[PDB]
């Protein structure tokens, strides 16, 4: 009923990484290590790095799923709001209900769980491009945290799982997400609040 969010590096040493994008008013996506929280604008590119200490097998996959952070809402499926699920902004692959999309990966697959009704998007694990030290997946979040009838200002977490070809767990990481109009300003505010 509630997927695990326990960090788990597993046998391959799996974990996420994030760019250092700053907090200027014009930034479209920025990650706060002190809050373990990503702030991004609606439907904008969010680069998420994948790191491992050793090479996983061919057919390893990487899945992303959103859940509500608060206890009283964890059982509710995170989905796009009644407006955005009907705004015909499909990319041809992502179902219009899904909050999380993968940008620019034709091997992305979108799951509606037959049992939990939860949504997820999964791509094959790939080695870094020649000359890079990690692999990057580009995610888009397709509703605002504030969207009425949808997330309705409730905070969410993204859970990233490394999986084998059967879907068995190999590694797990997670981060909070706020989809908002001004990520740089809101990251500065929430970090100030944390210190105060
Ligand atoms: C998880 C992304 N990633 C890395 C990230 C980071 C690194 C470390 N670079 C210093 C290596 C890999 C890596 C190697 C192989 C595969 C792979 C082969 S067949 C399927 N997936 C994937 C890899
Ligand atoms: Zn919405």
UniProtKB/Swiss-Prot annotation:
Changing residue 135 to N: In sporadic cancers; somatic mutation. Changing residue 47 to A: In sporadic cancers; somatic mutation. Changing residue 70 to P: In sporadic cancers; somatic mutation. Changing residue 102 to G: In sporadic cancers; somatic mutation. Changing residue 181 to P: In sporadic cancers; somatic mutation. Changing residue 188 to G: In sporadic cancers; somatic mutation. Changing residue 58 to F: In a sporadic cancer; somatic mutation; requires 2 nucleotide substitutions. Changing residue 176 to K: In sporadic cancers; somatic mutation. Changing residue 159 to L: In a sporadic cancer; somatic mutation. Changing residue 107 to L: In sporadic cancers; somatic mutation. Changing residue 79 to K: In sporadic cancers; somatic mutation. Changing residue 44 to Q: In sporadic cancers; somatic mutation; mimics lactylation, leading to decreased ability to undergo liquid-liquid phase separation and activate the transcription factor activity. Changing residue 107 to G: In sporadic cancers; somatic mutation. Changing residue 80 to G: In LFS; germline mutation and in sporadic cancers; somatic mutation. Changing residue 191 to G: In sporadic cancers; somatic mutation. Changing residue 156 to V: In sporadic cancers; somatic mutation. Changing residue 156 to S: In sporadic cancers; somatic mutation. Changing residue 116 to I: In sporadic cancers; somatic mutation. Changing residue 103 to G: In sporadic cancers; somatic mutation. Changing residue 33 to L: In sporadic cancers; somatic mutation. Changing residue 117 to I: In sporadic cancers; somatic mutation. Changing residue 86 to S: In sporadic cancers; somatic mutation. Changing residue 23 to I: In sporadic cancers; somatic mutation. Changing residue 10 to S: In a sporadic cancer; somatic mutation. This is Cellular tumor antigen p53. It comes from Homo sapiens. The lineage of its organism: Eukaryota, Metazoa, Chordata, Craniata, Vertebrata. The gene is TP53. The chain holds residues 96 to 291 of 393 of the full protein.
């Amino acid at each position: 009923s509630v997927p695990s969010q326990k960090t788990y590096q597993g046998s391959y040493g799996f974990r996420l990484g994030f760019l250092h994008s700053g907090t200027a008013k014009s930034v479209t996506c920025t990650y706060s290590p002190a809050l373990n929280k990503l702030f991004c604008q609606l439907a904008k590119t969010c680069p998420v790095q994948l790191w491992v200490d050793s090479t996983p097998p061919p057919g390893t996959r990487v899945r992303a799923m959103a859940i509500y952070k608060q206890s009283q809402h964890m059982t509710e499926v995170v989905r796009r709001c009644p407006h955005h699920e009907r705004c015909s902004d499909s990319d041809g692959l992502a179902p219009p209900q899904h909050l999380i999309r993968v940008e620019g990966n034709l091997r992305a697959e979108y799951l509606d769980d037959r049992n939990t009704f939860r949504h997820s998007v999964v791509v094959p694990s790939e080695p870094p491009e020649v000359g890079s030290d990690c692999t990057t997946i580009h995610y888009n979040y397709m509703c605002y945290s504030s969207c009425m009838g949808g997330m309705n200002r409730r905070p969410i977490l993204t859970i990233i799982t490394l999986e084998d070809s059967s879907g068995n767990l190999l590694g797990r990481d997670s981060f909070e997400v706020r989809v908002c109009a001004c990520p740089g300003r809101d990251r500065r505010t929430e970090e100030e609040n944390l210190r105060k």
